[PDB]
Amino acid sequence: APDIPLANVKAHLTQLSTIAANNGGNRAHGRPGYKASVDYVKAKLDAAGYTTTLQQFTSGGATGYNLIANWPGGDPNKVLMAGAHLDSVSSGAGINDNGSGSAAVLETALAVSRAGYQPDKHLRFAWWGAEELGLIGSKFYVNNLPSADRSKLAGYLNFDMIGSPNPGYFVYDDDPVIEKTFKNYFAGLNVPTEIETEGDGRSDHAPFKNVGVPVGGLFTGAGYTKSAAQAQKWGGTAGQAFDRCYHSSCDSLSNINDTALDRNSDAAAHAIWTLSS
Numbered sequence: 214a215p216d217i218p219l220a221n222v223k224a225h226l227t228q229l230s231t232i233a234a235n236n237g238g239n240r241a242h243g244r245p246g247y248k249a250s251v252d253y254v255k256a257k258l259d260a261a262g263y264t265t266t267l268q269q270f271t272s273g274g275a276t277g278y279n280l281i282a283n284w285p286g287g288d289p290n291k292v293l294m295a296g297a298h299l300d301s302v303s304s305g306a307g308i309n310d311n312g313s314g315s316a317a318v319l320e321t322a323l324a325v326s327r328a329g330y331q332p333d334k335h336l337r338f339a340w341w342g343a344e345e346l347g348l349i350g351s352k353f354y355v356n357n358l359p360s361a362d363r364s365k366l367a368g369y370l371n372f373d374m375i376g377s378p379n380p381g382y383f384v385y386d387d388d389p390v391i392e393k394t395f396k397n398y399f400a401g402l403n404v405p406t407e408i409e410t411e412g413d414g415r416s417d418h419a420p421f422k423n424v425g426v427p428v429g430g431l432f433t434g435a436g437y438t439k440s441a442a443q444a445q446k447w448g449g450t451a452g453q454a455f456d457r458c459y460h461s462s463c464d465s466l467s468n469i470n471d472t473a474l475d476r477n478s479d480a481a482a483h484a485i486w487t488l489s490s
């Protein structure tokens with residue numbers, strides 16, 4: 214897999230920050246900052262050769278969108294998906310939650326095109342709307358995915374909060390092959406990982422997991438406090454939240470740990486390459 218350039222991931226975050234500023238301070242469902250975020254991500258993917266779909270839904274009386282991007286080619290019967298919710302809460306720009314995952318998935322998708330990669334499995338990326346309303350966009354996608362297509366899914370990889378400023382390195386303990394692939398990447402860096410427990414089912418992998426699609430993912434922690442043992446293994450500040458700006462107006466460009474964002478973006482690309490061969 215290629216390295217994912219940290220600077221490129223950061224640049225997507227800068228664009229999402231500007232989009233929030235230009236649209237009332239947020240990128241929330243039903244608010245213009247969300248659709249503007251969609252439009253930015255879609256234009257990059259379209260230019261790189263993806264077949265994109267804007268999947269519309271209505272929730273709370275307002276139109277929402279999922280952005281689906283299919284890389285042409287690969288076995289239609291073995292589809293590997295990766296995704297990240299693209300909405301924020303309305304209090305702020307949602308740069309760690311979840312600009313970070315959205316930007317890593319976008320830069321990985323662009324990396325596939327730059328590398329001229331032809332995965333054996335068909336790749337499909339997704340940016341979900343309205344996750345902050347209760348996984349509404351990913352539930353909509355799974356609920357509207359025919360059973361014949363659901364059975365073609367080899368896996369769904371989720372990236373939701375991967376740049377926390379006081380990070381942990383959490384890997385979902387779900388499908389064994391997906392989990393092993395992420396933990397192998399971190400082992401190559403000599404960075405230990407822990408099982409994800411803080412967020413559990415509270416992200417867009419849940420609708421997939423609940424219908425038997427193998428899932429996995431990466432997370433760097435939210436409002437829980439980093440323990441003494443976690444600060445010893447990862448650095449940072451024991452006794453402070455992983456993300457002191459969770460769901461806050463201060464979830465801005467200053468609310469990112471560059472090392473965590475880099476490591477998790479690189480691990481996302483590593484897993485996508487390994488699991489699509």
Ligand code: MED
Nearest residue numbers: 310373374412415416432
């Ligand atoms: C990764 S599970 C934590 C859920 C948090 N991202 C949220 O979007 O509210």
Ligand SMILES: [Ca+2]
Nearest residue numbers: 216217219479
């Ligand atoms: Ca990198």
Ligand SMILES: [Zn+2]
Nearest residue numbers: 310311373374
């Ligand atoms: Zn999130």
Ligand SMILES: [Zn+2]
Nearest residue numbers: 302310345460
């Ligand atoms: Zn959130």
